[PDB]
Structure formats: structure tokens, C-alpha cells
Amino acid sequence: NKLSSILQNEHDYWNKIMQSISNKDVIFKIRDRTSGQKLLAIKYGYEDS
Amino acid sequence: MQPPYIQERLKSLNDIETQLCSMLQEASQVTFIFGELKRGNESVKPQFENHVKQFYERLDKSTTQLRKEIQLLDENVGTNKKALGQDTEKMEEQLDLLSAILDPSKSK
Amino acid sequence: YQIKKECALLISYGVSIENENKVIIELPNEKFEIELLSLDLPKINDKRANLMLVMLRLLLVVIFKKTLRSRISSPHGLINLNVDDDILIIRPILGKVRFANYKLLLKKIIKDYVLDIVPGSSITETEVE
Amino acid sequence: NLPLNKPRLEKLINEILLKSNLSLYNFLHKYVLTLQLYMVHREFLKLANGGKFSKSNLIHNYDSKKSTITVRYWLNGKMDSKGKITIGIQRTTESLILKWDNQSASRAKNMPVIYNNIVSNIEGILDEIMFNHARIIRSELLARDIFQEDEENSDVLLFQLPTTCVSMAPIQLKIDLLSGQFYFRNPTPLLSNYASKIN
Amino acid sequence: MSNQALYEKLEQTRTILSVKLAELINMTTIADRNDDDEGSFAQENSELAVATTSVMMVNNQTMQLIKNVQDLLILTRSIKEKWLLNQIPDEKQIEELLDNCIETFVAEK
Amino acid sequence: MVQQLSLFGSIGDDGYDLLISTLTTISGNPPLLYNSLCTVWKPNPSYDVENVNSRNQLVEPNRIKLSKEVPFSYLIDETMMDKPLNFRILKSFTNDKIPLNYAMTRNILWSLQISDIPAAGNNRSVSMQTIAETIILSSAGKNSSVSSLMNGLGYVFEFQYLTIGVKFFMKHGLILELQKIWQIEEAGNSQITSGGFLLKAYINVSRGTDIDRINYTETALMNLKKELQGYIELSVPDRQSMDSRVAHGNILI
């Protein structure tokens, strides 16, 4: 019961993430200086332009 | 938006974890039913075979489909780029704005 | 940033920098102020300022395209922009305005000293590419 | 609000007092002066990246052992002077002071050479020094009686030049407030060449 | 790489099957069996340690099932993340436009 | 005169398209089409060069390379003007036949180039070769022609070939080339690099005495090679294959 409740909670967040994200864009994973974990990052500068 | 192929790939993966959740749930009901079967009422005895069979068939084909996905990974290999045109598109839109500025009848 | 680095060399012709976010251009009859401001009645020259902003953006895009073309052309060439040559943003607009002013002044001078003195003179205006 | 090392300070002060014969006050004053000098240097570092004086106008060198800062300005200036400023601890008042090391500033009257409150108005002090040096140079030029005085503008020098045989007209020369090179309002190629020669 | 994930999921599935059969047999014959014949092998010698071994079985099957399922879910998410990340993929009109713009500015300046 | 530091490799055309994309993912630049035509000339055997100091071996005879660019209007047949002039045209260049034939090249008759065998020793990680180069701008006279010029020097024609491929410019002056080579004779045209592309990554150093620069160049080349691990294997070719002296005959192709 505990596993089902929690697990369906993370499918709720999972579906929110999946259907909230759009797309060409330079996307990668980076390690935060303060947190140290992996987070999604997008390159939007004109450095390569 | 992403190309469709990735879309049905993610749909299949989502189906995979939903099937896993269904397998866990059915494990919960079979564990529940075995308790009263040990208690000594034989009415729910026929349901036990159905639950066991559905549990096993849910366990098997889910792993089979995941195996198919990992196989797809095998042949999918070999099958800032936007920046190369990014300035260009920016250029375009800027001139479009000038057109809107240039024509006073369209500023309404 | 490009505007700052470009106008730092135009002090001798009546262009100054007020602060880290303001630049001022003076003309015998006009004043232009370019400011970088944080968010924290239709006049006559509002369209003029909008056009100025548009062409400034266009010139920056042209600079970027020139940089990319030079980079693709040859690998050895170090891409270090020259302020005297590469950065051309305020130069064309200022040149056009001051050239128009001088054209008007010479028109007036010719009219006073030739047209008003020698009748029948015929004047033709042309542009050469 | 500074994150002071309270326990290490406790042991240090206790040890000093135990070994004391005064010394604690001297150490505290020295540390305060060193911290003020370091934060002044940090402010200089922050300003130099984006400041008006970034393009070789100002160079600062800091020595911790002597706890002094030497500032050199107007590198392209050879008018029998070199713009030098020394920030250091004053012996008499035990306070950090800024001195504009210049003989022209030395014999200049009604003009302070030493300034305080550097942290609050370092930019104002630098602007005042810049204007004072420009005014001293302009006054020397007027004393030589080569440029006539401009009544409308106190920072503009008038040079008399005949444009034609009969015309006798003044030309306005101005001093750059940042690097200090003389420039004309509308210089001709020969005028620009000779302005560069003047520089 | 992917073959290692294949193998890991293989022991994952076989471990599920084995622990499933183990908990099934343990709970079914949880009712202790007494048979006079020497062929049968069921021993309950110390009374309460029997219950200790029972709760042993319970805790083992719980931990192993939960860990295996969670590992499989994390593996699926890793596959999806790899899917998302790793898969590497007139002039004349402008002339008169700029001409009109510049003449308009010249007139308005 | 340069010290050229180079690494070599080859690929099958099947992966060609894929390879191209990966390169653009790394360099950030698009490929640029190019072509060239090289003619090899050798000393005339009719003339006895007794001046070769046999007792001392001060020098040995060598072969001269003359290169020129040829417009694509000679390489595109009547079926290909519809497609734009980009890299994809290389996908149609798999046949041993080519529009440029022997007669046109004979009608043509620049950059003059001489090289030496790479440096000896087994402690070299990249192929280091010495190149001496000059340029011919124009000419005049009663017999102004490349053939007459090289016969005046004392050289005669040996063979020729045509290269077509794409170029990638990366940082630090690194140049990466994908090539296809067609040997040309009156008998016909034969593609030596049959069913594949020849890959060559190289850098140039202007002064051989500077060693900090050479170390930097080697570092960049080995880093590039270690980036492409698992896709393509870049290797140092055989030192005895890049020898172009007349006495011994072989040609890396």
C-alpha cells in the first residue's frame, strides 16, 4: 500500500514533467556548484553563433 | 516538439512502468487472498488460479517488452547546431519588425 | 558593451559617456541619448528612436555574420576584433546625419554665393556607387 | 555581520593577555587597518574590470608586508611629471591616508594633497585629483601665455591661429579627463597629427 | 554497457522467480510437517527460533522484492534519459526596405 | 617550408553520412566542398646526373608535385545541375567513371611542392614530415606552359590523379579532410579508394626549431584522436610508405 501510494505519486510528477517539457536545443546534465547533483541545463547563448 | 519516434518510445516506456505498478498491485491482492485461503474458506479458491495466472503473465510480457526496447537501443545507434542558423532567424524577425514599423497602417 | 567600446574612440567628434549605462551624442541641432535601464502622447521622433534601435540590432547581427564568415574562411586567422575596423555601429548613422547636415550647409553656401549672384545656373544632384 | 572566528579570537586574545606585560589593542588596530586596505584593494579590483579607467588609465600594486598601495595613472604622460599616489598608514595618526605624490601638488596652494574617507568616496577623490592635475597643467600653460583664457569654459584652452591672410580665429583645445591627451573639437588631418605630436 | 544491463535484468528476473517460489513454499508449508518416514526432512527443534526463522523469511522476501522492483524502475528511467540525451541529430525586397527606412530617417532627422 | 604533423585513417562509405553529422556536433562548423588536381613529375632518365655524390650521398633524386584547383563545372555531368553544390553530391561519386577525362587534363597542360621521408625513430606519436613549397603565378614566352617549364628544369611527367572531398576546420589550426582519389590515364579512370573515404587529420608548424609549439600540436592531435575512440581508429602510417624518392617506387594511396 505504501509503495503503491508513493509510486503513483512519482508517476504523477513524472507525467507532469513529461507533458510539461517541449523540445534542436542544446540540453545536457550539469553538476551544481552548491548542490553537487545532476540537473538539466540548456545552452541559449550566442557563443556558437 | 520532439520527433514522433521518441514520442512512441516514451509512451512504450510509460506503459512499461504502469505494467510494473499493476504487477505490484496484483501481488498485493494475491498476498491478501492467500491469507483467507489459509484461514479456511474455500469460496475464493477459484479466484486464486486466475490471480496467479494473471500475475505471472503480467510479470513476463512486461520484461519481454523492456527487452525489446533495449534491443531497439542496439540498432538505433547510427540513426550548437541551432546556432549555425540562430543569428539568421534573429535577423529575419528583426526585419519583420521594421516592416511593421515601416507601414503605419498595420500598427493597430 | 560594443557601443561602449566603439564610442570610447569618438570623443574628439562630440560623443561622450555619462555613466556605465548612458552614452550621449551631440549634433549642432540635436541630442541622442542611449541608455540601459532596468524595469525596477505619441511624439514626433518616437518612430525615429525605434528605427535607431532596429538598425543598431541589424548592425550587430551583420557583425556576427562577418565574424562567422571570417572564422569559416580560414583556421589560422586569430579572431581578434579590431575597434578601428570591425566595430561599425554608430559610424554609419552618424556619418549619414553629418553628411546630410554638410550637404544642407553647402547647398546654402552655393545658393548664397552662386545662385543669388549668377542667374541661370543649373544644378544636378547625383550619387556614385 | 562579518563571520568572525569567535573561538580562535578568544584563545588568541587570552594568550596575548597572558603573555602581555596594549599589545592586544595594537594587534586589533593593525588587523583593522589591514582589513580596510584589503577591502579597498578588492573595491579597486571590482571597479577596474568595468570602470572608466580600465584601458590602462589606472594601475594599482598592493604590498601586504609594507601594507601600502601604489597607484600609477596617465602612463602616456611625459609633461615632466608622473601621476603617482601612495595609500598607506600615517605614522602620526596611525590611520590609513592617501597622498598624491607630486611636486606640482607639493607646492600647490589651497589644495589638499592628503585625503581621508577613501572607502566612501574613492571615486570622488580620484575625480578631484584628476581635475586638480588638469587645472595645474592648464594654469602652467596660461602662465607661459601661449593659450589665452576662455571665459565661457574653465577647462577649454583657446589657441589663436590665422585661418586665412586676414582672419585670426581661436581654436578650442580640451583635456581628456581620463587619460589626459589634448584634443581639438574638429581637428583637420594636420591638426590631428600635431595634436598627437603634442600628446 | 547495454549488454551488462541485459544480464543484470536477467538475474533480476530469475531472482524474482526464485524468491517468489521460496516465499510460496515457506508460507504453504509454514504449517510444520510431521512425517514418521525417514524420507521427509522437516525439523522444528527449538520452539521460538522457529518463529525467528519465519520472520527471517518474511524480512528477506520483503527487502528483496522491494529492492528488485525499485532497481528495475530506476533502470527504466535511466534508459529513457539515455534516449532523450544521447541520440545526436528574397534579397531585393530587403534592399528597397532598407532604402525606404534610410530615406524616411533622413527626412525625419 | 613546414613541419606537418599528421594522423591517418579510412572509413567505409556506409557510415559516411553518420560520420559527417558527428563531426559537425564536435567542431560546430559545416563541411565545405573542395577539389584538386595533382601532377607528379620525376627527373628525366635520359640525362645522367653524375652530380649525385655517390661516395658521400649529399643528396638523392626526388619527385615534384604540382597542384591546381579545377572548377566543379568540369566534374558535374548533365544529370547533376538540379542538386545544389554541397557535400551530399559525394554520395553519387561511387563509380569509377568521372566527367573529367584524359583529354581535358592534357588540354590543361599552381603550387609546387617537395617533401622528404618522415623522421626516423620509434618514439614519435604522429607522422612528422618536412615540406618545401613555392607558388607559380603566371608565365609568358613562346612556350609558356607547365609541361615546357618542367622540361626546362629537367623533369618529365609521370602520372596524375584527382581528389574530391570535404574539409573541416577546428580550433588551433587543425584541419580534417575526407577524400576520394581517382587515378586518370588514357586507358580510363579508376577509383583507388574504392567503396570508402580516406581520412586525414593534420596541423602545420611554420618553424621546426620551436619545440613548445610542436609539443602543443602533438597534444592537440592526440586529444583529437582520443576523442574519436570507438568510432574510427586514427593511426600513424608506415614510415616506408611515405617515401617519394625516385630510387624506390611506392605510393601511399
From Swiss-Prot, chain B:
<keyword id="KW-0010">Activator</keyword>
<keyword id="KW-0175">Coiled coil</keyword>
<dbReference type="GO" id="GO:0005634">
    <property type="term" value="C:nucleus"/>
</dbReference>
<comment type="subunit">
    <text>Component of the Mediator complex, which is composed of at least 21 subunits that form three structurally distinct submodules. The Mediator head module contains MED6, MED8, MED11, SRB4/MED17, SRB5/MED18, ROX3/MED19, SRB2/MED20 and SRB6/MED22, the middle module contains MED1, MED4, NUT1/MED5, MED7, CSE2/MED9, NUT2/MED10, SRB7/MED21 and SOH1/MED31, and the tail module contains MED2, PGD1/MED3, RGR1/MED14, GAL11/MED15 and SIN4/MED16. The head and the middle modules interact directly with RNA polymerase II, whereas the elongated tail module interacts with gene-specific regulatory proteins.</text>
</comment>
<comment type="similarity">
    <text>Belongs to the mediator complex subunit 11 family.</text>
</comment>
<dbReference type="GO" id="GO:0003713">
    <property type="term" value="F:transcription coactivator activity"/>
</dbReference>
<dbReference type="GO" id="GO:0032968">
    <property type="term" value="P:positive regulation of transcription elongation by RNA polymerase II"/>
</dbReference>
<keyword id="KW-0539">Nucleus</keyword>
<protein>
    <recommendedName>
        <fullName>Mediator of RNA polymerase II transcription subunit 11</fullName>
    </recommendedName>
</protein>
<feature type="coiled-coil region">
    <location>
        <begin position="56"/>
        <end position="100"/>
    </location>
</feature>
<keyword id="KW-0804">Transcription</keyword>
<dbReference type="Pfam" id="PF10280">
    <property type="entry name" value="Med11"/>
</dbReference>
From Swiss-Prot, chain C:
<comment type="function">
    <text>Component of the Mediator complex, a coactivator involved in the regulated transcription of nearly all RNA polymerase II-dependent genes. Mediator functions as a bridge to convey information from gene-specific regulatory proteins to the basal RNA polymerase II transcription machinery. The Mediator complex, having a compact conformation in its free form, is recruited to promoters by direct interactions with regulatory proteins and serves for the assembly of a functional preinitiation complex with RNA polymerase II and the general transcription factors.</text>
</comment>
<comment type="similarity">
    <text>Belongs to the Mediator complex subunit 17 family.</text>
</comment>
<comment type="subunit">
    <text>Component of the Mediator complex, which is composed of at least 21 subunits that form three structurally distinct submodules. The Mediator head module contains MED6, MED8, MED11, SRB4/MED17, SRB5/MED18, ROX3/MED19, SRB2/MED20 and SRB6/MED22, the middle module contains MED1, MED4, NUT1/MED5, MED7, CSE2/MED9, NUT2/MED10, SRB7/MED21 and SOH1/MED31, and the tail module contains MED2, PGD1/MED3, RGR1/MED14, GAL11/MED15 and SIN4/MED16. The head and the middle modules interact directly with RNA polymerase II, whereas the elongated tail module interacts with gene-specific regulatory proteins.</text>
</comment>
<protein>
    <recommendedName>
        <fullName>Mediator of RNA polymerase II transcription subunit 17</fullName>
    </recommendedName>
</protein>
Swiss-Prot record, chain E:
<comment type="similarity">
    <text>Belongs to the Mediator complex subunit 22 family.</text>
</comment>
<dbReference type="GO" id="GO:0003712">
    <property type="term" value="F:transcription coregulator activity"/>
</dbReference>
<keyword id="KW-0010">Activator</keyword>
<dbReference type="GO" id="GO:0060261">
    <property type="term" value="P:positive regulation of transcription initiation by RNA polymerase II"/>
</dbReference>
<dbReference type="GO" id="GO:0005634">
    <property type="term" value="C:nucleus"/>
</dbReference>
<keyword id="KW-0007">Acetylation</keyword>
<keyword id="KW-0804">Transcription</keyword>
<dbReference type="InterPro" id="IPR009332">
    <property type="entry name" value="Med22"/>
</dbReference>
<keyword id="KW-0805">Transcription regulation</keyword>
<protein>
    <recommendedName>
        <fullName>Mediator of RNA polymerase II transcription subunit 22</fullName>
    </recommendedName>
</protein>
<comment type="subunit">
    <text>Component of the Mediator complex, which is composed of at least 21 subunits that form three structurally distinct submodules. The Mediator head module contains MED6, MED8, MED11, SRB4/MED17, SRB5/MED18, ROX3/MED19, SRB2/MED20 and SRB6/MED22, the middle module contains MED1, MED4, NUT1/MED5, MED7, CSE2/MED9, NUT2/MED10, SRB7/MED21 and SOH1/MED31, and the tail module contains MED2, PGD1/MED3, RGR1/MED14, GAL11/MED15 and SIN4/MED16. The head and the middle modules interact directly with RNA polymerase II, whereas the elongated tail module interacts with gene-specific regulatory proteins.</text>
</comment>
<keyword id="KW-0539">Nucleus</keyword>
UniProtKB/Swiss-Prot annotation, chain F:
<keyword id="KW-0010">Activator</keyword>
<comment type="subunit">
    <text>Component of the Mediator complex, which is composed of at least 21 subunits that form three structurally distinct submodules. The Mediator head module contains MED6, MED8, MED11, SRB4/MED17, SRB5/MED18, ROX3/MED19, SRB2/MED20 and SRB6/MED22, the middle module contains MED1, MED4, NUT1/MED5, MED7, CSE2/MED9, NUT2/MED10, SRB7/MED21 and SOH1/MED31, and the tail module contains MED2, PGD1/MED3, RGR1/MED14, GAL11/MED15 and SIN4/MED16. The head and the middle modules interact directly with RNA polymerase II, whereas the elongated tail module interacts with gene-specific regulatory proteins.</text>
</comment>
<dbReference type="GO" id="GO:0070847">
    <property type="term" value="C:core mediator complex"/>
</dbReference>
<dbReference type="GO" id="GO:0003712">
    <property type="term" value="F:transcription coregulator activity"/>
</dbReference>
<comment type="similarity">
    <text>Belongs to the Mediator complex subunit 18 family.</text>
</comment>
<protein>
    <recommendedName>
        <fullName>Mediator of RNA polymerase II transcription subunit 18</fullName>
    </recommendedName>
</protein>
<dbReference type="GO" id="GO:0016592">
    <property type="term" value="C:mediator complex"/>
</dbReference>
<dbReference type="InterPro" id="IPR019095">
    <property type="entry name" value="Mediator_Med18"/>
</dbReference>
<dbReference type="GO" id="GO:0005634">
    <property type="term" value="C:nucleus"/>
</dbReference>
<comment type="function">
    <text>Component of the Mediator complex, a coactivator involved in the regulated transcription of nearly all RNA polymerase II-dependent genes. Mediator functions as a bridge to convey information from gene-specific regulatory proteins to the basal RNA polymerase II transcription machinery. The Mediator complex, having a compact conformation in its free form, is recruited to promoters by direct interactions with regulatory proteins and serves for the assembly of a functional preinitiation complex with RNA polymerase II and the general transcription factors.</text>
</comment>
<keyword id="KW-0805">Transcription regulation</keyword>
<dbReference type="GO" id="GO:0003713">
    <property type="term" value="F:transcription coactivator activity"/>
</dbReference>
